[PDB]
Design a protein around this ligand. Structure first.
Ligand code: CDL
Ligand code: T7X
Ligand code: CPL
Ligand code: 3PE
Ligand code: PLC
Lengths: 89, 469, 114, 303, 171, 86, 86, 92, 184, 64, 76
């Protein structure tokens, strides 16, 4: 597989360099998962086997759960809730 | 027994007040105690090393998995006792050790992920268990998010573990592309000899071992251990390591690996030398765990290593729990508290502890000597089994590195005792409050295990010989 | 083959990124008037705004619940083939998910400003 | 080639005219109870051409809203694209339709518009959960993602009759999906895209619950009128199917503008709480009961 | 096996069949006639078909080249039964396949033509239509009365033929 | 009273949709050669239409019930040459 | 496990080779496992077709270095619209 | 209670029609499935005969191109003697 | 016609390269989100080209209408009340990248003579100048699609995996609630 | 011997109780009923382990 | 005015309280728990009285379990 592997390479090296760009690092995590899924789906199609596609959907669900957890982490980190709690208990 | 506990906890904690957290954790403590003492008879399924496959070849079950499983319940019982039971009945200790509403549920889900890692028979199950454990441990690390010191550690651990899990998935999918399979049952001697799938397994072992933090990827987990709350650090630094190392031992995919051997030597050297450069307790214990991880990784280079690994992991788990609980008990004997999450930071704050609780210092001396390997404590016997195993396979340079690493690590282990046996003229601001009887009993039981577990060495050897052969 | 592509592509784009990132070494040193923020003065008089935790929880929990729903699609495409065994498995799956739904309902985590 | 071009041109013209005329319909309906913008904006948008993706966002959102129509049938096999995954394609387009409000909120570079976009986006995803839930509930009776297949299974009985509360839930969730009261240059693009999404949701409800193009059986009528297959008979049957489907669509449309010109507007917090406290528990109950009902009577649908 | 991909082209082979294997006439009926006559073909040639499969699994991979002869037998039996139909029940067969083509190849919308063809074949071809695996408690789907599902439009000339037959009394 | 002006554009949309659907039905019939369309076709259906196209000489969906096929069908079998998926 | 299942619920492309290889492994032991090398080689060939690719490369190299004509029925390519025509 | 009782009747009558429709569709699917079952032996044999003709044709084509070269064409890449349909055709 | 359809896959690959570079080479987080949305669209088209249109639909559904929507939602929360994110210097981590990448280049370099028998593997890997032959058979009678097979395997063969992913979704429900709201 | 194993386990329990008392900065004879409880519990664990050992030896001998 | 009487204090009193004071949750639980319970307690009754389950549908060709018999007819 070409496209998946090259997306994975580019996103991995984008992660390694920035490493302090949490928005972009988490984007790179998402794109690396996408690149792995592409390779897995291509090999599943080539082999005509269902295990590749099953692992692909499992990776999709795990990626969604991971994205939800990570975005909750970013909410807590950047204090997205806001405060305006001045003059209050 | 664990799924039902998780479901019941979600249901019960949903409809409970915040003040019921201690009671719920106690209830689960006795629940797990009864699970161990009442369902322990299941070890009869594994006479003569009988092995079973469960859930359509997705899980494996033998005496090794059963023993790691029971050890994980024992560790979980001890750690959950550290949360349910109050060390001191005063508002300060109320504030420092206060469990979150979801902490016990996350703990049980992480235990479930670790057990599924240990029992995995397929790469799909392996990856799913890894992701379960990883997401749970991220949530455990982040559930105390009132500090930037903990927040940076949570974010770093999330991102580094995400990269590591992506690498693991990439290796698994490369294996699938090569063989059109997701299980190790398709790997035989002919399969290894004919085709070069060694690099795939090396990459998989790399990704798995970096999750527990071997060199040269140790600094991030050491920072995380330093910055997380100590009641969280005691858990996040033991259970994932146990799960990953048990899966690696049972997988048996790194026979006489040059890369694994070099990385183990590097891990030992880094852990031993970097420990000398530490003035913080948490970083010192992190490098101690790194050195122990290197010791156990030395066992990945040879076969028939089940007994040595099991003995070493059990004794190290007991010693790790004991040393963190000693550090927790010593909090009462210092004049100031660093943070709400990490009340003690520097080894210098333990100075003169022998004038406040001499028997606490005695227990710490026992556990530190077991870490060094002074007979007849369990640590010496675990290190001796490691030495016997490595000399049986002819790794002489590895043995020399092991001995040198132990000798170097003894220096920064005795650093703790030397600091603690000093003289502190500053008298305490606190006096006569009684420490918890349950937690003190558990700590004393751990110390007595470390001190007198060598009585049952022959009994354990015979049980292993009959149940693993 | 994927490993090969990975290994040889690492040095090339690695050096490219290395060069393009040694470029910013010095650049726009953000000498902007950062004086009122290093003191603690405010110039908005307005734009306070707020976000109840329930709002962001609705936004975030749209994702796991949508995954839960979309996981039902494979079942409805093979409902007849796996009739009773699959029916029981889906019942257990749904009950486990409803445990979490009960958690989010009892906690009242999703109730916007009252 | 020519036939396909003529068909797609006719369908696009009809859809665009319907969307444009529904604005006038809504205005007149409001008046009694109590267009031409694309050409000027397209040249302005072309003049504008990171600015690139931000500039291209509105028209591509409108294109997505229009492509949502490619799978809507007007009869057995009568569609631009006969997709075996028409339900999944419809769900994907409906999911993509939430980007319009967000990018429109960004377009103005205004904080108040951004709050509007955030509230709208949260409400849209909240009721997208309901819409997808009802979609899957319906699919549980068909075991197929082909829209024409579901419409054909609805010959025995419209799925509305066994699931009338589901019809009410879908209608409420549809009024709340598009921020329609009481459930409330790029502007013209987003406006027509929004109304296209409204008509798409009406069509979704129509072929999920109201039977689609079906009407009273006309086998006897065709037997009396005609003695053999002819283009006149095909034209008449197509006219009947399309008239029935369009009358159902118009009824749903009139219901939407009626609730706009009806029961008083509700607050946003109540709008989301109604979905997350009242609708979703019912939908999970239906998730549990429908397969249970099919298992009790041994009626699991086949492929 | 999976279907083709984004780019695929069909390549035509004009090489002659090897002379060692005998040449046999092959079925020329399209989809609708085959759907109409599948039950009769199966009823007449089930033993040859069973022999064909049994050889296919016994050859263990070489079914294409080792099971030629009974495959020739099966195609000969199919040609024989189709010739019997094409010289025997022309009208009913034409009704049935035309209706099936006009009714999206679904057997539900052509019960009248199905019945006509069934009576023709059972009357003077000595072949009977049945669905295996049915217990005597339940009655066959093709003999049902008052169906749950009705065709969109009943075929005009098919209904006329049914009415003419029921005036005759053949049914 | 019923507002006819309010319902006028609704009727316009109704009529436009009806006429468009009728035209689409007529066009589909003309393209199919006077027969109804095929919907929800699986792999078996696609293979059947491919075989029918091979049999009838490419005359659309024309059906022939002749027992003996012409000699052209003995050599018109075509395989699909898939581009390698990189 | 989901091994041995294709994308349509049937038997995958390399079902026969894998079945033969696992039967050979079951009928043999660890010491005699070396006898089952051809089965694993055939399974890997079904997975990747390396030997087939090498043979095709040799054939193409031989073909591209020849100038004389070929007297043998070649393969004709036709458009999808021209399937079964003439 | 009249509306609730009527709603049960409306839903009950709809379910009875809906439930029955599924069951008959299963029977119709059963009839459709058995129709394709009988057609497989005649359709599969026709493809099998064509497969042999194309396989031998490629072997005859390949051996004539390589005439005068020391290579083995009839030797299959696989180790077993079973018939194997040739794949990976050379682009035209 | 044929010229474009033969290189649709390569066009998607090149567009993916451009989108990923634009992702890792921007300043505004919005630009990266929009370009990863474009990358997801390109991945969907690429999956359609292979013959996985259902997976492309699943991608467009989940990764865009949920994941990307939540990404853009969270970023929009960061902008209405302007809170610029502090930009720390990566020059701290540049030296380690230098050392590691020089080590990797040297590891690829001392191969030298052995590259003559290893680079050729990638040389024929790049070529791939053979077309797959697609043959037809009639062994399938049921109208079974990819999603049906997914459901069958996930509900019967790997139902345990389905239950463990149920626990994973349970975790994804509990965790955000645990770390987002202040109880009592 | 079983009696010796029970005595050793009970002594280990007594040592654990004594160590717990001394850690809490309490006299050695603080809660003697706790000494009894700890000794009984540890003796029971020792009895279970001794039974496991006896069964292990029985299994080892039986395959001869 | 209204206070929860507690489920454990009285089951039927709490059932009435939920039906009258919390309609949405009570009905959600009612339809949710009816499904599996009614299935378990009614499916055997339906099988015994209403109608037996249908015969399994074919998934592939039914292969006879026998040896190849010698047949005559339609030879070359
Ligand atoms: C659906 C399909 C069927 C499966 C699910 C069935 C669920 C039935 C729920 C009925 C009750 C609903 C209800 O109102 O509950 C309260 C609550 C809402 O009502 P509420 O009054 O507003 O609650 C607020 C309370 O005031 C504030 O809370 P509270 O103080 O009232 O406490 C709430 C408490 C209490 O909540 C409940 O009571 C709800 C759950 C009841 C489960 C009952 C299981 C009993 C098992 C043991 C039975 C034998 C006991 C021993 C007898 C002697 C034996 C020698 O919640 C829990 O702790 C959960 C239960 C804990 C685990 C129980 C199950 C153990 C495992 C059993 C395994 C099965 C073995 C089979 C053996 C077969 C042999 C052949 O709803 C739930 O808790 C949701 C359901 C929870 C299910 C678990
Ligand atoms: C296989 C090998 C693996 C592990 C070996 C470990 C342990 C062996 C097994 C079991 C150990 C369990 C023994 C139960 C007997 C222990 C026992 O006397 O109770 C407790 C603690 O009790 C646990 O906290 C009991 C903790 C139970 C769990 C211990 C697990 C470690 C100790 O009395 P204590 O004088 O503090 O007792 C209390 C007294 O009851 C109160 O009235 C007073 O107010 C209070 O001040 C104090 O005097
Ligand atoms: C009333 C039921 C309560 C049982 C709950 C047990 C929880 C175990 C948890 C944490 C580990 C603590 C030490 C366990 C001892 C090993 C047992 C065994 O023999 O180890 C063998 C395998 O040896 C090995 O490879 C190496 C083991 C390394 C042990 C290192 C610690 C040494 C000091 C401990 C001496 C014990 C002091 C007791 C004082 C009365 C497993 O034996 P097995 O799989 O055949 O089953 C055992 C039968 N069982 C389940 C009833 C118990
Ligand atoms: C499957 C269910 C799917 C939908 C899930 C809905 C989630 C709701 C979770 C929840 O919060 O329920 C408990 C709720 C809380 O009660 P509340 O007083 O609001 O507590 C305030 C907290 N401070 O408690 C309630 O108020 C609701 C409790 C109602 C329980 C009664 C209904 C149970 C069904 C029994 C009858 C079923 C029909 C007859 C069956 C006959 C045979 C057994
Ligand atoms: C929890 C649900 C309990 C409901 C119990 C009702 C049973 C009443 C007895 C009438 C059955 C009958 O006599 O009609 C029989 C019908 C149809 O079968 P048939 O083809 O005509 O029979 C011939 C048998 N063959 C084909 C094998 C020859 O069967 C049914 O499925 C209808 C059941 C009524 C609707 C129940 C829907 C449940 C409500 C769902 C709300 C979410």
């Amino acid at each position: 597989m070409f496209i998946g592997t090259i997306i994975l390479v580019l996103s991995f090296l984008g992660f390694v360099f920035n490493r302090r760009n949490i928005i972009l690092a988490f984007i790179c995590l998402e794109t690396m998962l996408l690149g792995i899924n592409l390779i897995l789906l291509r090999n599943s199609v080539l082999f005509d086997d269902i295990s590749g596609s099953l692992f692909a959907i499992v990776i999709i669900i795990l990626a969604g759960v991971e994205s939800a957890i990570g975005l909750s982490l970013l909410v807590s980190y950047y204090r997205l809730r806001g405060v305006i709690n001045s003059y209050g208990i | 027994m664990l799924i039902l506990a998780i479901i019941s906890l979600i249901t019960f904690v949903s409809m409970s007040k915040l003040s019921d957290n201690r009671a719920i954790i106690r209830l689960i403590n006795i629940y797990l105690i009864l699970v161990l003492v009442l369902d322990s008879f299941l070890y009869l399924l594994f006479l003569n090393n009988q092995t079973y496959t469960v859930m359509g070849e997705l899980l494996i079950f033998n005496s090794f998995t059963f023993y790691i499983d029971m050890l994980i319940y024992f560790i979980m019982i001890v750690i959950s006792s550290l949360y349910g039971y109050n060390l001191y009945n005063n508002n300060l200790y109320k504030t420092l050790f206060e469990p979150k509403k979801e902490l016990i549920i996350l703990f049980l889900i992480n235990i479930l992920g670790a057990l599924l890692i240990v029992h995995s028979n397929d790469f799909i199950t392996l990856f799913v268990a890894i992701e379960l454990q990883s997401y749970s441990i991220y949530l455990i690390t982040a559930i105390y998010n009132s500090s930037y010191k903990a927040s940076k550690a949570s974010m770093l651990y999330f991102f580094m573990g995400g990269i590591l899990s992506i690498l693991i998935a990439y290796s698994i999918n490369t294996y699938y592309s090569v063989l059109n399979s997701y299980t190790l049952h398709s790997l035989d001697s002919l399969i290894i000899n004919t085709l070069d799938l060694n690099l795939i397994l090396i990459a998989l072992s790399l990704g798995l071992l970096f999750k527990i933090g071997i060199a040269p990827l140790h600094k991030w987990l050491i920072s995380i251990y330093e910055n997380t709350p100590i009641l969280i650090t005691i858990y996040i630094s033991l259970i994932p390591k146990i799960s990953i190392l048990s899966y690696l031992v049972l997988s048996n995919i790194s026979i006489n690996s040059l890369v694994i051997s070099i990385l183990a030597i590097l891990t030992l050297l880094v852990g031993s030398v970097g420990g000398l450069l530490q003035i913080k307790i948490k970083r010192l214990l992190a490098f101690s765990g790194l050195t122990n991880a290197g010791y156990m990784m030395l066992l990945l280079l040879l076969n028939n290593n089940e007994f040595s690994y099991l003995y070493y992991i059990t004794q190290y788990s007991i010693s790790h729990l004991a040393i963190f609980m000693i550090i927790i008990f010593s909090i009462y004997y210092i004049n100031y508290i660093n943070n709400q999450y990490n009340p003690i930071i520097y080894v210098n704050q333990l100075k003169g502890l022998i004038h406040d609780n001499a028997y606490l210092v005695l227990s710490m001396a026992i556990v530190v000597f077991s870490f060094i390997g002074i007979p007849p404590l369990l640590g010496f016997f675990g290190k001796l089994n490691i030495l016997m195993s490595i000399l049986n396979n002819g790794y002489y340079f590895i043995s020399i590195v092991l001995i040198v690493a132990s000798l170097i690590s003894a220096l920064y282990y005795l650093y703790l005792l030397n600091v603690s046996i000093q003289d502190k003229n500053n008298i305490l601001i606190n006096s006569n409050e009684t420490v918890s009887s349950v937690l003190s009993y558990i700590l004393s039981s751990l110390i007595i295990l470390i001190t007198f577990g060598f009585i049952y060495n022959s009994l354990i050897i015979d049980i292993f010989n009959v149940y693993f052969n | 083959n994927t490993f090969i592509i990975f290994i040889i592509l690492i040095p090339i784009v690695g050096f490219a990124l290395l060069a393009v990132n040694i470029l910013l070494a010095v650049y726009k040193p953000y000498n902007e008037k950062l004086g009122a923020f290093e003191c603690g003065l405010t110039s908005f008089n307005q734009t306070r705004l707020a976000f109840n935790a329930a709002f962001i929880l609705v936004a975030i929990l749209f994702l796991p619940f949508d995954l839960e729903i979309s996981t039902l699609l494979p079942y409805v495409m093979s409902i007849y083939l796996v009739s009773n065994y699959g029916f029981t498995i889906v019942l257990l799956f749904l009950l486990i998910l409803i445990i979490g739904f009960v958690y989010e309902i009892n906690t009242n985590a999703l109730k916007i400003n009252k | 080639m020519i036939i396909n071009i003529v068909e797609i041109l006719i369908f696009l013209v009809c859809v665009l005219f319907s969307v444009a005329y529904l604005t006038v319909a809504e205005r007149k309906t409001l008046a009694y109870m109590q267009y031409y913008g694309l050409l000027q904006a397209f040249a302005d948008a072309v003049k504008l051409l990171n600015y690139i993706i931000l500039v291209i966002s509105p028209l591509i959102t409108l294109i997505t809203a229009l492509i949502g129509w490619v799978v809507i049938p007007l009869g057995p096999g009568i569609t631009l694209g006969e997709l075996n995954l028409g339900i999944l394609f419809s769900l994907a387009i409906g999911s993509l339709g939430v980007f319009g409000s967000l990018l429109s909120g960004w377009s103005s570079n205004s904080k108040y518009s951004l709050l509007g976009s955030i509230r709208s986006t949260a409400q849209l995803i909240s009721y997208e959960l309901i819409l997808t839930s009802i979609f899957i509930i319906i699919i549980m009776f068909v075991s197929s993602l082909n829209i024409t297949t579901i419409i054909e299974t609805q010959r025995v009985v419209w799925y509305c009759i066994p699931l009338l509360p589901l019809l009410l839930i879908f209608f409420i969730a549809s009024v709340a999906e598009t921020a329609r009261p009481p459930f409330d240059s790029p502007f013209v693009f987003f406006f027509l895209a929004e109304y296209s999404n409204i008509i798409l949701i009406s069509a979704f409800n129509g072929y999920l619950l109201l039977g689609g193009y079906l009407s009273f059986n006309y086998s006897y009528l065709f037997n009396i009128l005609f003695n053999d297959y002819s283009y006149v008979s095909f034209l008449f049957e197509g006219l009947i199917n399309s008239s029935a489907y369009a009358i159902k669509l118009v009824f749903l449309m009139f219901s939407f503008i009626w609730v706009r010109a009806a029961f008083p507007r509700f607050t946003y917090d109540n709008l989301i709480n109604f979905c997350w406290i009242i609708l979703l528990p019912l939908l999970f109950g239906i998730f549990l009961i429908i397969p249970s009902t099919l298992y009790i009577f041994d009626s699991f649908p086949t492929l | 096996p999976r279907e083709a991909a984004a780019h695929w082209v069909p390549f035509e082979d004009k090489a002659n069949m090897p002379d060692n294997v005998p040449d046999v006439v092959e079925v020329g009926a399209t989809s609708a006639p085959l759907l109409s006559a599948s039950y009769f073909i199966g009823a007449k040639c089930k033993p040859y078909n069973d022999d064909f499969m049994l050889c296919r699994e016994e050859s263990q991979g070489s079914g294409a080249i080792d099971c030629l002869k009974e495959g020739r037998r099966v195609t000969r039996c199919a040609v024989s039964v189709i010739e019997d139909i094409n010289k025997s029940c022309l009208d009913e067969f034409r009704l049935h396949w035309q209706c099936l083509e006009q009714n999206n190849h679904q057997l539900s919308g052509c019960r009248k033509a199905e019945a006509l063809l069934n009576k023709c074949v059972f009357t003077k071809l000595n072949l009977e239509k049945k669905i295996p695996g049915l217990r005597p408690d339940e009655e066959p789907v093709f003999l049902k009365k008052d169906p749950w599902i009705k065709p969109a439009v009943d075929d005009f000339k098919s209904v006329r033929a049914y009415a003419e037959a029921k005036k005759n009394g053949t049914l | 009273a019923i507002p006819f002006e309010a319902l006028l554009p609704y009727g316009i949309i109704f009529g436009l949709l009806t006429a468009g659907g009728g035209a689409m039905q007529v066009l589909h019939v003309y393209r199919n050669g006077g027969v109804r369309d095929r919907f929800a076709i699986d792999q078996w259906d696609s293979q059947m239409m491919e075989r029918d196209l091979r049999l009838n000489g490419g005359q659309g969906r024309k059906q022939v019930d002749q027992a003996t096929a012409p000699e052209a069908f003995k050599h018109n079998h075509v395989w699909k040459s898939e581009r390698p998926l990189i | 496990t989901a091994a041995g299942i294709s994308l349509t619920g049937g038997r995958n492309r390399c079902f026969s080779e894998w079945q033969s290889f696992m039967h050979c492994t079951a009928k043999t032991d660890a010491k005699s496992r070396a006898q089952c090398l051809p089965n694993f080689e055939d399974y890997m060939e079904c997975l990747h077709h390396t030997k087939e690719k090498a043979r095709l490369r040799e054939i193409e190299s031989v073909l591209k270095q020849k100038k004389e004509g070929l007297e043998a029925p070649p393969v004709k390519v036709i458009p999808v619209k021209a399937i079964g025509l003439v | 209670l009249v509306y609730l009782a009527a709603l049960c009747g409306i839903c009950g009558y709809g379910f009875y029609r809906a439930l029955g429709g599924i069951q008959e569709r299963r029977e119709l699917k059963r009839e459709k499935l058995w129709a394709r079952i009988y057609l497989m032996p005649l359709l599969q044999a026709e493809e099998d005969r064509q497969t042999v003709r194309r396989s031998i044709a490629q072997l005859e084509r390949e051996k004539e191109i390589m005439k005068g070269t020391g290579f083995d064409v009839d030797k299959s890449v696989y180790n077993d003697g079973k018939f194997h349909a040739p794949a990976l055709m050379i682009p035209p | 016609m044929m010229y474009l359809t033969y290189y649709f896959i390569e066009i998607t690959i090149f567009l993916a390269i451009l989108c990923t570079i634009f992702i890792i080479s921007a300043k505004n987080p919005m630009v990266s989100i929009l370009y990863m949305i474009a990358l997801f669209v390109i991945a969907a088209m690429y999956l359609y080209l292979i013959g996985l249109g259902i997976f492309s639909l699943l991608y467009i559904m989940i990764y865009i209408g949920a994941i990307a929507v939540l990404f853009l939602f969270i970023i929009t929360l960061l902008d209405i009340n302007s809170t610029e994110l502090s930009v720390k210097s990566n020059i701290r981590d540049l030296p380690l990248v230098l050392i590691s990448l020089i080590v990797l280049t040297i590891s690829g370099l001392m191969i030298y003579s052995n590259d003559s028998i290893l680079i050729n593997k990638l040389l024929e890997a790049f070529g791939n100048d053979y077309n797959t032959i697609i043959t037809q058979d009639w062994f399938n009678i049921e109208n079974t699609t990819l999603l049906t097979t997914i459901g069958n395997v996930l509900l019967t063969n790997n139902a345990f995996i389905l239950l463990v992913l149920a626990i994973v979704l349970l975790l994804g429900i509990i965790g955000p609630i645990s770390i987002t709201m202040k109880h009592k | 011997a079983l009696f010796t194993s029970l005595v050793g386990a009970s002594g280990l329990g007594f040592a654990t109780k004594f160590l717990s008392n001394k850690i809490r900065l309490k006299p050695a004879g603080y809660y003697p009923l706790g000494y009894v409880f700890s000794g009984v519990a540890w003796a029971g664990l020792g009895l279970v382990l001794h039974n496991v050992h006896q069964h292990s030896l029985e299994v080892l001998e039986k395959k001869k | 005015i209204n206070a929860n009487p507690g489920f454990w204090n009285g089951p039927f009193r709490y059932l009435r309280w939920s039906a009258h004071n919390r309609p949405h949750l009570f009905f959600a639980f009612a339809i949710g728990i009816a499904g599996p319970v009614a299935a378990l307690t009614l499916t055997p009754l339906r099988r015994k009285y209403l109608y037996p389950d249908h015969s399994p549908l074919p998934q592939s060709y039914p292969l006879p379990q026998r040896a190849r018999e010698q047949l005559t007819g339609f030879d070359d």
